[PDB]
Amino acid sequence: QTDMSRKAFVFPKESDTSYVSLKAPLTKPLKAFTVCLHFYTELSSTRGYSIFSYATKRQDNEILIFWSKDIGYSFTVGGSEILFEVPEVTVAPVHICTSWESASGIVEFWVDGKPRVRKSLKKGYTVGAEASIILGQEQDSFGGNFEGSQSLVGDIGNVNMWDFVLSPDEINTIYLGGPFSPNVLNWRALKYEVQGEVFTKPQLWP
Amino acid sequence: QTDMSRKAFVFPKESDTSYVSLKAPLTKPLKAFTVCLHFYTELSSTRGYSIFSYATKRQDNEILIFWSKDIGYSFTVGGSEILFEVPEVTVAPVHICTSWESASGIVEFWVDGKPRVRKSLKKGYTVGAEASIILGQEQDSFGGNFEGSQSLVGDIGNVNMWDFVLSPDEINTIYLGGPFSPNVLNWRALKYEVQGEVFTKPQLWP
Amino acid sequence: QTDMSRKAFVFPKESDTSYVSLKAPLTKPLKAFTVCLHFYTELSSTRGYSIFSYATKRQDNEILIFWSKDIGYSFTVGGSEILFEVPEVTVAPVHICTSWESASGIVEFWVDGKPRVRKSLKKGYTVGAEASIILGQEQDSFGGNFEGSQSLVGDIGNVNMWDFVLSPDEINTIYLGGPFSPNVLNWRALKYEVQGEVFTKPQLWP
Amino acid sequence: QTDMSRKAFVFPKESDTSYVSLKAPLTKPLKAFTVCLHFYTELSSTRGYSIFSYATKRQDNEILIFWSKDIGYSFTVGGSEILFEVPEVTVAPVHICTSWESASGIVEFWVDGKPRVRKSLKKGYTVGAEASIILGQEQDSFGGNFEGSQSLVGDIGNVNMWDFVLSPDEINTIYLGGPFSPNVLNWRALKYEVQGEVFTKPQLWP
Amino acid sequence: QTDMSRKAFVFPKESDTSYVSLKAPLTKPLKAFTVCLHFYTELSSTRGYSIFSYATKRQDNEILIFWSKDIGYSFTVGGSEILFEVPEVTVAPVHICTSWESASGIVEFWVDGKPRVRKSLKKGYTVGAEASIILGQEQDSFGGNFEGSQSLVGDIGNVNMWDFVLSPDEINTIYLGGPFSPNVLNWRALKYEVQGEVFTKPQLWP
Amino acid sequence: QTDMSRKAFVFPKESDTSYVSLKAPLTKPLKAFTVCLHFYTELSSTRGYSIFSYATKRQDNEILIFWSKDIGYSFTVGGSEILFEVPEVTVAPVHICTSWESASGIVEFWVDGKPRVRKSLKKGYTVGAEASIILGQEQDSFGGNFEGSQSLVGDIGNVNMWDFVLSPDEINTIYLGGPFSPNVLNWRALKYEVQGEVFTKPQLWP
Amino acid sequence: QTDMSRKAFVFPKESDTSYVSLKAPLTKPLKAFTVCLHFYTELSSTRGYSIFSYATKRQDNEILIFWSKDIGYSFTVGGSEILFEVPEVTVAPVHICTSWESASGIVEFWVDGKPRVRKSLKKGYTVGAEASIILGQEQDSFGGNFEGSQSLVGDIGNVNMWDFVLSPDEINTIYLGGPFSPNVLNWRALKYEVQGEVFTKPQLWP
Amino acid sequence: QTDMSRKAFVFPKESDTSYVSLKAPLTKPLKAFTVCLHFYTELSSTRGYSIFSYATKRQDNEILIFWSKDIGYSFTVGGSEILFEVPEVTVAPVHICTSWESASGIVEFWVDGKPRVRKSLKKGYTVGAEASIILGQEQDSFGGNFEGSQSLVGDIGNVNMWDFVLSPDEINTIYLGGPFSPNVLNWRALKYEVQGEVFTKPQLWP
Ligand SMILES: C[N+](C)(C)CCOP(=O)(O)O
Ligand SMILES: C[N+](C)(C)CCOP(=O)(O)O
Ligand SMILES: C[N+](C)(C)CCOP(=O)(O)O
Ligand SMILES: C[N+](C)(C)CCOP(=O)(O)O
Ligand SMILES: C[N+](C)(C)CCOP(=O)(O)O
Ligand SMILES: C[N+](C)(C)CCOP(=O)(O)O
Ligand SMILES: C[N+](C)(C)CCOP(=O)(O)O
Ligand SMILES: C[N+](C)(C)CCOP(=O)(O)O
Ligand SMILES: [Ca+2]
Ligand SMILES: [Ca+2]
Ligand SMILES: [Ca+2]
Ligand SMILES: [Ca+2]
Ligand SMILES: [Ca+2]
Ligand SMILES: [Ca+2]
Ligand SMILES: [Ca+2]
Ligand SMILES: [Ca+2]
Ligand SMILES: [Ca+2]
Ligand SMILES: [Ca+2]
Ligand SMILES: [Ca+2]
Ligand SMILES: [Ca+2]
Ligand SMILES: [Ca+2]
Ligand SMILES: [Ca+2]
Ligand SMILES: [Ca+2]
Ligand SMILES: [Ca+2]
């Protein structure tokens, strides 16, 4: 396990071969989750890119956080999709947290500490446990079939995941940088593989 | 009575059947009132929605707070109506307080602690005590005939009602949060009934 | 003498019958004055309205502070007008102070504590002491003949009048609500008479 | 109400006359509370001092937060006391939060975002709502009988009070300076009287 | 079961009455185990206290983790005891994991993710499955004869037990927080009885 | 001398007769200078106007600071000119400092304490000492031939001149109002003669 | 070595002759560098200009920091280019730090303390140490063939160079102006040669 | 004046003759001030020494900052003293800022960016304008009677003085070396006279 604190993955060119694969010894299917991360890219005005892609063999888009050009964030679970439209986009590092709960289907989406309106997605679904989590690319098969037009170029880091919906009070602590313990995917205790050109560099964001 | 402090009702899908009904111990009819609430919705740029509907068996719009698209707040009492123009809207939780006095008909409208100009509405009228108070829907009959196109989608909370006009100083403490005690309808001690797809969640707004 | 502190006159409808008359204890003709006030109205984009109207039996616009649509503050003395043009008007309570001095004709206009450029008007003129001072209406005779399309709608208050030019240091303490001692017309000890639909309410501006 | 944000009360002399009294127009007796405040003094090695004194007519020490020489924090409700021993102290501003709940009697003490062990005090008690809240002095009758040897010297500020136990996640947000809404006593909306040599100055702490 | 996630048991007073009893589904006898728990108490300087007490009808100290004053952690299995001396102790929540393997008698002790030196205890022994597990008290019969001077005061939580020796890589995830699945006793699927004055509260530690 | 501190000249009407003439106790020819003055006018969107016109018997624009409509500050020395283009003009008092040095021809221009980029003008020139210095008008002979279209309207004050280039730190104190000693032209010890409609009033700018 | 602290080179006219040649003591070829400098010019809306031109006998654009009109910053290493496109620019002094590392080819660009997204350029290349470093011109042979249309007009200063990538926290202190020790090119110990019309003046920026 | 930036006065031997006298352009008697300086000395364990000595012909200790052995900083105004005790001292360059305000008598003392607790001294006094400011010695008459046992040995510099209390966030910029413009005594525009064995050297500290 590597402590990536103060470090970010740098994807400095467009390619369909640069990715990092994050490992979770998760054994229970997810009835809820939260995923929080920082990314920095200047693509947002040019084209869409995958921020965070979770794939199971039944479903390449089992959790996907995606930027869609001139729309905003695409959040999708179980292949189904909801949009958080973002008309003004400004070139700065952006922190997001997103939570999903099966029992209500409520999606919470938070950007730089501000909540988006709660929306409904995939109520009653369950996210599979045997999953391939990939950064820098969008999976169209379990761990593969990357599309270069969907790769992230720039920085991603502080990638933390919980198998429960964080309350707003917790997320305020996360964004302010108070202490927290992610129970699914821990940036302080991260197991990952790097493929192609990806670099580990000092994070540009505070 | 239930203490709903720091909780909000979530209306995550459009429907004509998701609503909550609030019970007021209101025996005397109202010569004046104040109602304050937080709501959060994406709809303001898409369509109108009912924020707060108070109906009496003789009058379906006995008090109604309505967002009307490309206009702003429609505030109506006894079926008569006045508008508070809002040309531009930002995606954030919004707190409103509204008060009406029969003896003058003066309406105060407050948004995020800013007063709108006082206006005259239904001077000398008297609001009926026997009322069906509903969140999430627009009612065209006592407790029913909802229109799905008028439903609220998003969050509503801290719904407090006084049978008297709050002073500006009091309204400021409602907004900033200091101590107060509503006497018609009280979020700390609410009686409510929930129908359809409605959830109680931690409030997004501080 | 009524201490109107923290209170304001509310004109909640357009009419040509609602007004209040303020009884200056003046007997010397004014060689100079300052009038300062708070008002709040939505008309500024709809139509012109009288703010403060001072008339004498020879001259109905002996002092007039007037908002003229798409222009700004019309300020008249002795029936002659200068414009303090206002390109963008935004709906908030607005404090003004206006000062005139016969010995030079200089008009000072101050809006929310910022000076407009000094402009000359009516050098050598004299303002009659036997004056009907009216709020809420524009008057075209001594005490009447108001026009509804020139009436004020919304709030007016803190009307203070001095028979001398306040220096900028003093006008600053007026805007900040420091102590001051008006010697022509004192809001903290006002003689007034109300006619038609006018209400005394808590002031909305802090 | 005054927005005291970014400002602190300075008590720059030892005295029995300097105090500020904080008004909390509170309806129900408190079954629970949280009081958070930031303060700075060098007295800690010289003598004890009152930090926050809440009295009712029955009980001069109905809530008291007190530094006790060589012991540390003294926390008392209803005149019964517990100690949070502090063996080593530094001259720095210290932020504290203290929560009490009647239902369990559990006291949470938090210093600079670190929790002290939960302790039991006054289970089943009920703190009176009609209270005199004093800063700068310890009080022994409802509004008075101060002791100069128990006065605070230095700075006190960010005094916020809630009528409920904040969760740990909330308190983290407070200490990090996240957004929050105190519902009893609110630094952004403080109504207070100053007596004696007390000054409002920019806060020394961030 | 109960999901106790983010909750701790609070024992806010010294007594022999307050305890919780935890039920393992354990029917195989233990040839090895790991127990991990997070606790917080101020007793460490005042007196010894029981952290975790596993008893069988034949042996009341079948597994016991005990803090002994001015000595440190006492780990005993089958009545044989070894110590991990702790010369200096600071009041902060402490996480420990202990592992014992019969096939070698090796004891692993981990404090806040730092390993102690491996020690040998009870090689070849076998721990009985017919067990009573108690938190808050030390027990000397199968479920009682508690001693007030040995009771825990403060908080214990995240009590997880495995019938096998966790690897150091695993124990790092337990400390930092990543995914794991205990099979003897699972905090996220806990069966327990509360007895006496015990409260469930938000865990103070992240 | 007259100490004009806290006072400004008021030019309240457009004319070709209102001016003040300033006297320099100067006989050495200027190899360099700084001129600083604060002015306030609304003309800037209507037409150009002279800010500071310095003439010698050989050259009517020997130093001229001139606002030119839709361009900005014309600065001219010895009749040669450069422009400091200004794309957006607020109606507020504006403070300028301009400095010229013969040895390099560098012009510094500073507006409200922000420097313009340095530019080159009249390298190797020298300004005559026997000069007529006029505020309010743009002179085309040694003392006259004014033009109404070029007059200033509004206020001008704090006119200070040095026969050396002030450094940036020095200019910062001028803008902030630190101590300085103007050795060519001193507002605190000014010699001036007034002609026509010109008044001395309290400065509007703080 | 001249300590140029708080001084800037001024290039007040367009020319192909005004330049400053800076000499590094550098013997080992650069595997990485940081160049950061502070400059001020109005040309940005009018034409491109060279900010920092580093050449070697094989390569006239060995390092170039260039402003390209209506595009933004051009950063070139070894004659390959990447663009940090700037949508909008204003007349203010701009501080930039840039860094390049051979091993990864990552380029960092920082403007006024804001990082640009990290980009890739000339991975595996190496910059020659036998270098001519010229401010004021863009050079097309080792120390000459300056294109007048590429000259900088305005100010440049604080030119500091390191043979390594500064971390983000270092670069922050540079922009703050904390302690730093450039080891290739030190403004506080600058070896430089002026040619043509160039002046050294007090720096305009703080 | 001289720009003393990056340079310090060195008093490398004990004497009663080496001093520098600083000339304030101070026009007016001080109702408040701030003084900030860097000094470095090994005397702190051996004996007291004067850091900054301000005298008027009435008063030899009109402002004095003085290290007193085994105690800390004596700060005195008008000859009355307050102590900021410093129990442990470390041999490193020391930056202090001290502030006093007559209207409250509040003294602020800041060492290396840490505020001391605010204290009261000489409320209602006013510091005289005709003053001898001396570094290196303590003066007991207007310009003289130095005591060798009170001389500073070591370095003093960055001596900046304001006639107003700097805000705490200003003092951060002073300590950080952000921009500032002292208006009583400016190290970047110092007027001084050097007496005896005193040298100007590059400052040892950053
Ligand atoms: C853009 N998107 C997130 C809807 C789809 C991503 O690509 P794909 O998974 O449909 O192939
Ligand atoms: C207020 N409003 C007219 C916009 C909506 C009222 O809806 P309804 O009550 O007429 O169905
Ligand atoms: C609107 N106005 C103030 C410019 C002119 C008003 O003229 P009148 O209506 O008082 O006769
Ligand atoms: C409890 N205490 C003794 C530490 C503080 C209060 O003292 P007192 O209010 O009884 O005078
Ligand atoms: C001493 N000890 C606490 C480590 C073990 C014995 O305690 P006990 O079970 O005999 O009461
Ligand atoms: C060109 N100018 C408008 C800046 C100045 C004109 O001066 P003048 O030619 O009118 O005397
Ligand atoms: C074109 N450019 C801006 C990248 C480089 C300019 O220098 P050059 O290519 O003219 O020598
Ligand atoms: C307090 N002190 C010791 C620094 C000074 C006392 O008076 P003096 O030494 O300036 O004469
Ligand atoms: Ca896919
Ligand atoms: Ca794809
Ligand atoms: Ca309807
Ligand atoms: Ca209806
Ligand atoms: Ca009229
Ligand atoms: Ca009229
Ligand atoms: Ca008491
Ligand atoms: Ca007492
Ligand atoms: Ca026992
Ligand atoms: Ca036992
Ligand atoms: Ca002319
Ligand atoms: Ca001319
Ligand atoms: Ca080139
Ligand atoms: Ca070229
Ligand atoms: Ca002395
Ligand atoms: Ca002495």
Side-chain angles (χ1 to χ4, degrees), chain G residues 60-61 64 66 68 74 76 81 138-140 147 150:
Chain G
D60 67 309
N61 293 25
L64 193 56
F66 203 90
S68 59
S74 160
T76 81
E81 175 180 57
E138 205 296 316
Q139 69 186 356
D140 295 340
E147 314 188 39
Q150 298 181 324

Side-chain angles (χ1 to χ4, degrees), chain A residues 142-176:
Chain A
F142 185 92
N145 290 95
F146 309 132
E147 295 201 356
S149 63
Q150 297 191 339
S151 64
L152 172 71
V153 184
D155 294 331
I156 194 161
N158 310 325
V159 187
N160 299 296
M161 205 191 172
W162 304 253
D163 63 358
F164 67 95
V165 176
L166 298 181
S167 72
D169 296 330
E170 309 173 65
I171 286 169
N172 282 280
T173 304
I174 318 304
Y175 173 70
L176 298 164

Side-chain angles (χ1 to χ4, degrees), chain A residues 12 40-43 45-46 91 153, chain G residues 48-49 51 61 64-77 79-87 98 105 107-111 115-122:
Chain A
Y40 193 22
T41 183
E42 291 178 353
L43 289 172
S45 59
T46 306
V91 178
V153 184
Chain G
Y49 56 91
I51 306 153
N61 293 25
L64 193 56
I65 320 172
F66 203 90
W67 179 269
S68 59
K69 183 179 176 66
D70 189 341
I71 295 167
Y73 307 98
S74 160
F75 187 70
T76 81
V77 176
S80 295
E81 175 180 57
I82 60 179
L83 296 174
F84 303 97
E85 302 181 308
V86 176
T98 80
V107 182
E108 287 178 26
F109 210 73
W110 292 73
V111 181
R116 303 296 294 253
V117 174
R118 284 178 273 220
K119 293 194 178 135
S120 186
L121 178 62
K122 286 302 285 192

Side-chain angles (χ1 to χ4, degrees), chain B residues 60-61 64 66-68 74 76 81 138-140 147 150:
Chain B
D60 71 315
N61 294 4
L64 174 69
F66 203 90
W67 180 269
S68 56
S74 163
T76 175
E81 184 179 339
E138 198 53 27
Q139 77 202 290
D140 297 321
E147 295 177 64
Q150 299 191 318

Side-chain angles (χ1 to χ4, degrees), chain E residues 60-61 64 66 68 74 76 81 138-140 147 150:
Chain E
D60 65 302
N61 297 6
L64 171 74
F66 199 93
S68 58
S74 167
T76 177
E81 178 193 19
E138 206 298 315
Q139 58 181 333
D140 296 304
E147 313 189 39
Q150 300 185 323

Side-chain angles (χ1 to χ4, degrees), chain H residues 49-50 60-61 64-68 74 76 81 138-140 147 150:
Chain H
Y49 54 93
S50 173
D60 65 297
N61 294 2
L64 172 73
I65 320 168
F66 192 102
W67 184 266
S68 57
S74 299
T76 182
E81 177 192 77
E138 196 279 327
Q139 77 206 320
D140 294 325
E147 314 188 42
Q150 298 189 320

Side-chain angles (χ1 to χ4, degrees), chain A residues 60-61 64 66-68 74 76 81 138-140 147 150:
Chain A
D60 68 314
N61 293 9
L64 174 68
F66 195 98
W67 178 266
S68 294
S74 164
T76 187
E81 180 181 73
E138 205 291 315
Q139 283 166 114
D140 295 321
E147 295 201 356
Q150 297 191 339

